[PDB]
Design an enzyme around this catalytic site. Sequence first.
Site, PDB file in Angstrom:
ATOM      1  N   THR D 266       0.819  -1.205   0.000  1.00  0.00           N
ATOM      2  CA  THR D 266       0.000   0.000   0.000  1.00  0.00           C
ATOM      3  C   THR D 266       0.856   1.261   0.000  1.00  0.00           C
ATOM      4  OG1 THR D 266      -0.316  -0.375   2.382  1.00  0.00           O
ATOM      5  CG2 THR D 266      -2.108  -0.945   0.906  1.00  0.00           C
ATOM      6  N   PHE D 391      -7.307   4.462   6.370  1.00  0.00           N
ATOM      7  CA  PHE D 391      -6.541   3.487   7.138  1.00  0.00           C
ATOM      8  C   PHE D 391      -7.396   2.580   7.990  1.00  0.00           C
ATOM      9  CE2 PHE D 391      -3.827   7.109   6.474  1.00  0.00           C
ATOM     10  CZ  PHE D 391      -2.877   6.485   5.721  1.00  0.00           C
ATOM     11  N   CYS D 398      -5.275   0.846  10.683  1.00  0.00           N
ATOM     12  CA  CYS D 398      -3.942   0.498  10.220  1.00  0.00           C
ATOM     13  C   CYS D 398      -2.920   0.757  11.321  1.00  0.00           C
ATOM     14  CB  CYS D 398      -3.603   1.286   8.958  1.00  0.00           C
ATOM     15  SG  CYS D 398      -1.942   1.019   8.412  1.00  0.00           S
TER      16      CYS D 398
HETATM   17  C1  FDE Z   1       3.211  -1.963   8.097  1.00  0.00           C
HETATM   18  C2  FDE Z   1       1.969  -1.369   7.533  1.00  0.00           C
HETATM   19  C3  FDE Z   1       2.062  -0.290   6.634  1.00  0.00           C
HETATM   20  C4  FDE Z   1       0.723  -0.027   6.366  1.00  0.00           C
HETATM   21  C5  FDE Z   1       0.287   1.036   5.433  1.00  0.00           C
HETATM   22  C6  FDE Z   1      -1.090   1.276   4.960  1.00  0.00           C
HETATM   23  C7  FDE Z   1      -1.479   2.201   3.914  1.00  0.00           C
HETATM   24  C8  FDE Z   1      -0.644   3.114   3.070  1.00  0.00           C
HETATM   25  C9  FDE Z   1      -2.870   2.121   3.776  1.00  0.00           C
HETATM   26  C10 FDE Z   1      -3.165   1.151   4.747  1.00  0.00           C
HETATM   27  C11 FDE Z   1      -4.319   0.623   5.174  1.00  0.00           C
HETATM   28  C12 FDE Z   1      -5.013  -0.161   5.992  1.00  0.00           C
HETATM   29  N1  FDE Z   1      -4.236  -0.870   6.832  1.00  0.00           N
HETATM   30 FE1  FDE Z   1      -2.192  -0.799   6.961  1.00  0.00          FE
HETATM   31  N2  FDE Z   1      -0.136  -0.808   7.005  1.00  0.00           N
HETATM   32  C13 FDE Z   1       0.657  -1.637   7.710  1.00  0.00           C
HETATM   33  C14 FDE Z   1       0.037  -2.537   8.427  1.00  0.00           C
HETATM   34  C15 FDE Z   1      -1.103  -3.032   8.872  1.00  0.00           C
HETATM   35  C16 FDE Z   1      -1.374  -4.064   9.769  1.00  0.00           C
HETATM   36  C17 FDE Z   1      -0.471  -5.000  10.531  1.00  0.00           C
HETATM   37  C18 FDE Z   1      -2.843  -4.020   9.803  1.00  0.00           C
HETATM   38  C19 FDE Z   1      -3.735  -4.934  10.599  1.00  0.00           C
HETATM   39  C20 FDE Z   1      -4.290  -4.043  11.695  1.00  0.00           C
HETATM   40  C21 FDE Z   1      -5.325  -4.824  12.439  1.00  0.00           C
HETATM   41  O1  FDE Z   1      -5.517  -4.562  13.633  1.00  0.00           O
HETATM   42  O2  FDE Z   1      -5.940  -5.708  11.822  1.00  0.00           O
HETATM   43  C22 FDE Z   1      -3.213  -2.997   8.918  1.00  0.00           C
HETATM   44  C23 FDE Z   1      -4.586  -2.568   8.606  1.00  0.00           C
HETATM   45  C24 FDE Z   1      -5.058  -1.637   7.564  1.00  0.00           C
HETATM   46  C25 FDE Z   1      -6.476  -1.460   7.223  1.00  0.00           C
HETATM   47  C26 FDE Z   1      -7.656  -2.142   7.854  1.00  0.00           C
HETATM   48  C27 FDE Z   1      -8.016  -3.448   7.222  1.00  0.00           C
HETATM   49  C28 FDE Z   1      -9.436  -3.794   7.665  1.00  0.00           C
HETATM   50  O3  FDE Z   1      -9.964  -4.707   6.959  1.00  0.00           O
HETATM   51  O4  FDE Z   1     -10.018  -3.195   8.670  1.00  0.00           O
HETATM   52  C29 FDE Z   1      -6.467  -0.438   6.132  1.00  0.00           C
HETATM   53  C30 FDE Z   1      -7.639   0.127   5.395  1.00  0.00           C
HETATM   54  N3  FDE Z   1      -2.174  -2.380   8.353  1.00  0.00           N
HETATM   55  N4  FDE Z   1      -2.158   0.655   5.443  1.00  0.00           N
END
Ligand code: FDE
Lengths: 450, 115, 453, 453
Positions: D266, D391, D398
């Site tokens: 990503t 995210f 994330c």
């Molecule tokens: C080392 C690293 C770097 C990064 C970056 C990034 C960018 C530029 C955009 C993004 C996103 C994201 N993530 Fe990211 N990332 C990472 C990681 C991760 C892990 C181990 C996880 C699992 C957490 C939990 O608690 O399941 C994620 C996680 C993530 C998410 C959520 C999936 C679901 O199915 O809820 C999203 C929408 N991420 N991302």
Amino acid sequence: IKEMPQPKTFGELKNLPLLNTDKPVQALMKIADELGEIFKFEAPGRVTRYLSSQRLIKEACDESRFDKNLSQALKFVRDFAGDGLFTSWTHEKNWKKAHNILLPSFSQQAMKGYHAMMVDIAVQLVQKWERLNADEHIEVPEDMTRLTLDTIGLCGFNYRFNSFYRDQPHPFITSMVRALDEAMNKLQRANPDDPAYDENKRQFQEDIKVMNDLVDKIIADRKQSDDLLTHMLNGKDPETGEPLDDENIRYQIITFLIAGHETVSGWLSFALYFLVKNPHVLQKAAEEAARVLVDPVPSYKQVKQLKYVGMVLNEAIRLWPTAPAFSLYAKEDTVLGGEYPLEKGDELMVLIPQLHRDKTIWGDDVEEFRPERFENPSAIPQHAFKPFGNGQRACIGQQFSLHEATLVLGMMLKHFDFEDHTNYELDIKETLTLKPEGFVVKAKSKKIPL
Amino acid sequence: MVDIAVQLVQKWERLNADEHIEVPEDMTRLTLDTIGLCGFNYRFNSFYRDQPHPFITSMVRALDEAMNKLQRANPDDPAYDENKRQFQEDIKVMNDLVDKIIADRKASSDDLLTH
Amino acid sequence: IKEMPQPKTFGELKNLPLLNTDKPVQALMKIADELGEIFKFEAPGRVTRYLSSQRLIKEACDESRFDKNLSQALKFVRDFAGDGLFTSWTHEKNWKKAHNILLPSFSQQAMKGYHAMMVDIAVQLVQKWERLNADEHIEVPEDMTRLTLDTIGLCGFNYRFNSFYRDQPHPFITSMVRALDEAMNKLQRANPDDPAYDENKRQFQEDIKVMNDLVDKIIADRKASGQSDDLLTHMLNGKDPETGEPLDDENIRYQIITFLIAGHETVSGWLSFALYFLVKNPHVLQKAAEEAARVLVDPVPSYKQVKQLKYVGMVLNEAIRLWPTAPAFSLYAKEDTVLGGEYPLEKGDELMVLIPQLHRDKTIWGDDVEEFRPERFENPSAIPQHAFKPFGNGQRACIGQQFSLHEATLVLGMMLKHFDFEDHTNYELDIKETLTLKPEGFVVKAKSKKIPL
Amino acid sequence: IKEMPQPKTFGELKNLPLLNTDKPVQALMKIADELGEIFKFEAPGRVTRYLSSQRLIKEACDESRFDKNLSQALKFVRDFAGDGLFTSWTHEKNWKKAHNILLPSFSQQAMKGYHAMMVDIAVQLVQKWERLNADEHIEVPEDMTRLTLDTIGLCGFNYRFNSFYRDQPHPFITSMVRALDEAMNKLQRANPDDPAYDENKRQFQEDIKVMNDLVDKIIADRKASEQSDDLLTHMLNGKDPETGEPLDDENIRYQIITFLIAGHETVSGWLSFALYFLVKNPHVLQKAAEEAARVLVDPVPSYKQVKQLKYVGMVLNEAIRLWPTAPAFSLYAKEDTVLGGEYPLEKGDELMVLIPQLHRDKTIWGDDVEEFRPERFENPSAIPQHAFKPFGNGQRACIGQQFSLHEATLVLGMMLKHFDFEDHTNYELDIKETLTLKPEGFVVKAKSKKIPL
Ligand code: FDE
Ligand code: FDE
Ligand code: FDE
């Protein structure tokens, strides 16, 4: 009362992948050789049992317990043949009605009327081959369907397809093959509603219009004769006094054009294959034809005397039955062979090429071409030889085929010597029927005039 | 009604010289469009279609089924499974089309549907 | 500068794989974007050079040095269009004969005669859109082909395809699309004699039969049953001054096919793209619907009024600038010459003009070459020569330019007068390529302004 | 109260044919444009409802009623990511266990430790571009995977992938893309157990063994001497505060896969998109290079300096808004509830957040949703809650969110300091879809500003 064998399963697809060939019937024969006298066969929504031994098929042919079933193949063919004799259910209005109206057209005396017209086309075949130059060859399956389509057309409907005036296959037959080819391919489609099949579905209708357009040309040429088509138009049902519905009459014409030329066309081609591969058998039938056909054109009585040619015909259709299977369902709950229970509505398929190779009935040389097994027609026990179906739903054109094939085969033997100049390897194309593909021979004229 | 009738006249005036007219098929085009507009303010546009309207095919097949069930001796015979299926397929299409007419009004009169 | 640019090569296949898309012309528009004004393109057995800049196109448009070529595309269309005007060589017999005989049918004296019949087809479209139920939408390119095919049939041949009485595309339209699609796919076959193409080779023929069966139906309604002053009377009765004779019946049939095809297919794309830019540029749509309300003051439009729909014509021209629906034409070298002073050409070398690319020249159109601004055509005289070539070049230019522009102007005028248009799907322009160009899934919803006809 | 919309149906296949393209997310974005804020999508065994509006997404992000679900896509990735952080249910033992031990590896204090390793990878990229010859060009997504993969390798595991010393991609990435594309293509299969997919099953397993042969290389190179304080130290030695145990050998194996994949794939897509918008929007590109020239006054940037590249971060925010390289996340209904007061839901019913569609809600962002306007992100406080969700959401958001942005700024900062970029091809944006999104075939030319390192 034990459990039934079953070939390999593919998760939710069941046994459907095993028939993923252009030759499903031969794939079933292998499964029959691998699993024996009966096996279960599942598809996404359908289940059927394939029978291969005379022991089980003998009870299946009892009309008190089993009735003709429309296999998934016939239900697809019903899309263009409808309720005509072949794809009709026994207990629906038009089967009984039409069966009794058309049966006079296949009596032994009606055959005497057909003989002159059958002789017409057969002479055309002899003349085609007599006019080949020394280098040319003959395409056996193509000239046989030229002949068999023309016969069912002239005798049945007084309509001339003029197949010998066409270097190309006749357009009715060319789309018919595509329609029969489509039907068989639908048995292998897991999800028939995938958009990928949109060209296949539209071609399918395009081919049905071609089949129906010809039928309306046959109908327009009438409405002077006492043929099969007169009987469809004029016969009364004794209980109600009425003739066949016009929509059915179109359905019966299609049925007779298809079933009345293709299975005969495969038949004659297989008989020629076995003769040209078994040269002693070929001279014995050639001796009988030279003996019996003493006139420039054959008479009806002379055909009845070609006993040995007839045995050639019966042994060919034993080995390769051109309509390879028929289906049954269980009228009422029953146990099969004292070992296999069946609930009412359970379905069976008679695997005809497997029944005819049952070692227990024919001896341990089932795969060899010996016409002398039918020198004693009475010797073979009931339900051991079933190339024309069973009972009241057996083939109605059962004598028409034998006379046509015998007459045609007789004149070829009288007029030509046949060389298998390419050492043809037998290749059986499957539409829904069987025919040898690319089978070719050479014919030296014995220079006997007509 | 004149709306529909003028559409029919204009269809016949725009045929080429060699063509002909199939009367019952063009009459169903006219009468059905008439009940749709006058009854439900709904336009089937049957004259803008070559083959019959899908409602018309499913309706006749349903009416054909109803008539044929009258002559039938043994109604559970396997021969009629397609018929029971197809009948139910034809019920859903007629109801779906009614669902389209009813919903198409909740948008938008003093016709039969208003009453 | 002397050596010529050329894209990636694939062994004995040369550049052919680069066009393995359903959209070859736009793929060529990307090779030009990377390689510039001219590049060499080799396929097994053929070679062509694609031109993109006005600088080289102005030289290729010199009729003393270059003459119209049958591109590999047109040679394949020649299998059913034959000896007709489009697929004819300049110097072979039936071109000049047919051109002189048929040019009177496209004078703007003839256009006033066609006008009443064009209005016929257009009212049928307005009435279809007024009779839709509230939830329905419109398939733009499909309804545009119904109208453009019906117009060429009625004005050209006094024949009614009656496409608005048909749910599916008219049978001619379906086989013709397959015949053009077969042609377009043949440019990509390394071995056209491969057995894999037997269904294609046979399917192609079935579709040729259907189009000719229609041509037989048109001639059956004429050269027997009757007195018109249309395109077909001129085909049957006009004479050649040098030979005194009319056209052979065989060539006439080829000319009927060509006018059914080239006379509606490019036009339906025109309206579809023009309507696309309108619902994507709503202020341009507002100004065009204001001119349409102003000029079209009668229940039916007159010839004089259509000549007055000036802003609509600029829209139509700015549409055909962005997406010229007949996207390329071919030329060859009459004699040895050097092009642009850097690229020599032996006699017979083939050049292909990439029309969408020539229309995207910044050195000519400025810095906003991709914006839809109809006011670039406000004084038509300001445009350089050989800068704007949507209708071809020279004596082999489109004979139907005044016919199409009049047809497209009239219909676009009536839609703007009778409807408001919604891009209810936020359609992303996806342009299907047969040999012509049109958008593929363009749909709109249309609110009727309830103005009578 | 309202029935839920559903697109065209295909018999027993339900809606499955509709996504049989290479770009299923862009196909769903189109379906959302016609069908609206929520629609039901049926497949033969499964049912899912796609949400596109901030109105409904704010309710789906309510953790008392909805919890993170494994879409059919993640259930397939769980075939090689196993019990890792991404593909575990929150109610599984290994989720909270791995979260609590690995969350420290992303605390701000760690970023300062990673910063030195991050610079190492980036300097290699700068000098790679400095050593290109004049006619050569740059493949944007190809060099960006080189950078992000090497970065997660050095920061995470003290392992040198040495991608810039490589022909075409590393064997891991080459094997991983096939595994991710197989996962994406299994979603279109009407019946998977069909024999036609045996080559695919064989190839999918062969690619799983390759990826593990590398985690085993990493584990063996570590326990062969070991005082690092990286993410892999925490996987091996840290004990969970709630349970007192450390991670499974089996699970440490699953997390290494997890972090190599989602932790570079990503990020590489993100950077390729930002560079696309920069070369297509020359006003923002100059403002971004004028700030980068201003802030990066040293031969190498410090952690403090990158945290001060405010406009660079705003570009990154507006890039990932338009094309969230992880295009969706899935939720299910803890218990029976009504969504939006209009659509009732049973316990366990599945919802999908269509992130590119959420970011195009004109009711939140204004009527210019398709414009690359970085200044929407000047005072982030105006942004309504749950309108910008690139995210994920909640406790399953994330984990490397800060890790990524810091890496992305550092590299984007240095490219702008050292180069001017030419979009020499007029690249037309083509979005390749693995399960993530990246531009396919994006190329630029870079003239060095000749600033030393
Ligand atoms: C080392 C690293 C770097 C990064 C970056 C990034 C960018 C530029 C955009 C993004 C996103 C994201 N993530 Fe990211 N990332 C990472 C990681 C991760 C892990 C181990 C996880 C699992 C957490 C939990 O608690 O399941 C994620 C996680 C993530 C998410 C959520 C999936 C679901 O199915 O809820 C999203 C929408 N991420 N991302
Ligand atoms: C015309 C004709 C001719 C013929 C021939 C023949 C040959 C060579 C062979 C044959 C066969 C047969 N068939 Fe035959 N064929 C015919 C016919 C027929 C008919 C119509 C039928 C049905 C019947 C009833 O059902 O009624 C038959 C029939 C038949 C059969 C049975 C069917 C079922 O499904 O069951 C069989 C197996 N077929 N085939
Ligand atoms: C009818 C019609 C219509 C039309 C239209 C149109 C549109 C819209 C567009 C167009 C175009 C064109 N065209 Fe066109 N069009 C037509 C036509 C034509 C013809 C006939 C031709 C040929 C000419 C000569 O050469 O002579 C053309 C033609 C044309 C061209 C050229 C081609 C070449 O190769 O050169 C072009 C580019 N067009 N176009």
